[PDB]
């Protein structure tokens, strides 16, 4: 089989910096009419550029290298952009729930460090979150749902630069 790569993505791999993280690789099972038990390796690859554009890719195949390569290229096909404060923290408090998992995410002032669970440490270093305290609640037994949940939870927040043109009201003085 052959995985796809476009033309205009080939200004980006020559463009931004990039890092790659496999989320988890999982072996599923199916007993099938005719020959027996067919398995697929499902692989989940995250890819960011450490400046606030994040990507996820889920891939399914028969063997582990081909599965991780498919999810590797699927993530690099699928990128979404996430606003940060100066590349280290998120704008608001963030709460979200994918499948039924209660993530709770807070901003922290820069130089707090990442106080953060296992895979989400590489995830926040991937997209570029240097200073965030998180906790995940509910059944945390799946890596895939915390990855997808984290992508949507990043996409939830609100940006202040879409106001100053049209609110008549200037937005500055960040002194605590």
């Amino acid at each position: 089989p052959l995985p796809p790569l476009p033309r205009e993505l080939r200004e980006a791999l020559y463009g931004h910096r990039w890092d790659r993280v496999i989320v988890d690789v999982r072996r599923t099972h199916t007993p099938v009419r005719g020959r027996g038990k067919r398995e697929e390796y499902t692989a989940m690859v995250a890819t960011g550029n450490m400046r606030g554009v994040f990507g996820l890719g889920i891939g399914v195949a028969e063997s582990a290298q081909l599965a991780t390569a498919r999810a590797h290229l699927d993530s690099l096909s699928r990128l979404a952009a996430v606003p940060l404060y100066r590349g280290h923290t998120l704008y608001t408090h963030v709460d979200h729930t994918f499948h039924r998992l209660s993530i709770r995410m807070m901003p922290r002032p820069a130089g707090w460090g990442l106080r953060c669970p296992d895979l989400l440490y590489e995830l926040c270093g991937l997209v570029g979150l240097r200073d965030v305290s998180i906790r995940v609640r509910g059944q945390r037994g799946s890596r895939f749902f915390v990855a997808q949940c984290f992508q949507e939870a990043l996409q939830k927040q609100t940006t202040p630069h879409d106001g100053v043109e049209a609110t008549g009201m200037y937005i500055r003085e960040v002194f605590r």
């Binding site: 791999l13 020559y14 910096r17 990039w18 890092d19 790659r20 993280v21 496999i22 989320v23 988890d24 690859v45 450490m50 290298q65 081909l66 991780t68 390569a69 590797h72 820069a110 130089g111 707090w112 460090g113 296992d118 895979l119 590489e122 270093g125 240097r130």
Partner: protein
């Protein structure tokens, strides 16, 4: 442009893609391992040659309690305020371990006669060595 990279961009010097045009499949991606943290603590102690837990732990809480701007230019400032790193900055030894032996002789003359605190430092600004 080439130099002065991000101070936590050490994932570009571990594994890279789109700069190796060969081997399109079978590219090694990093798993979820904490062993790079443990070996990074090994990189921390090997810069002192010291016993692993107590010194880097005590310097870790002192680095929290000293000032609160950040933990990157200031935690290595807690590393740099230590006397064996300070001697390595002077250049009285081939490496940190030989400097630690030289201070184990008490050949050193911090602040007049000797440091009052030999294993821990900490050299505040204004202290002669």
């Amino acid at each position: 442009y080439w130099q002065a990279r991000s101070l936590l961009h050490e994932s570009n010097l571990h594994l890279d893609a789109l700069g190796e045009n060969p081997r399109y499949l079978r590219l090694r991606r990093v798993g979820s391992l904490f062993a790079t943290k443990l070996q990074n603590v090994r990189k921390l102690r090997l810069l002192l040659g010291f016993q692993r837990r107590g010194f880097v732990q005590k310097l870790y809480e002192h680095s929290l309690l000293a000032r609160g701007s950040d933990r990157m230019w200031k935690m290595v400032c807690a590393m740099e305020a230590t006397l064996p790193m300070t001697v390595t900055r002077m250049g009285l030894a081939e490496d940190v371990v030989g400097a630690a032996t030289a201070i184990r002789n008490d050949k050193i003359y911090v602040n007049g006669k000797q440091p009052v605190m030999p294993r821990k430092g900490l050299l505040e600004p204004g202290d002669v060595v």
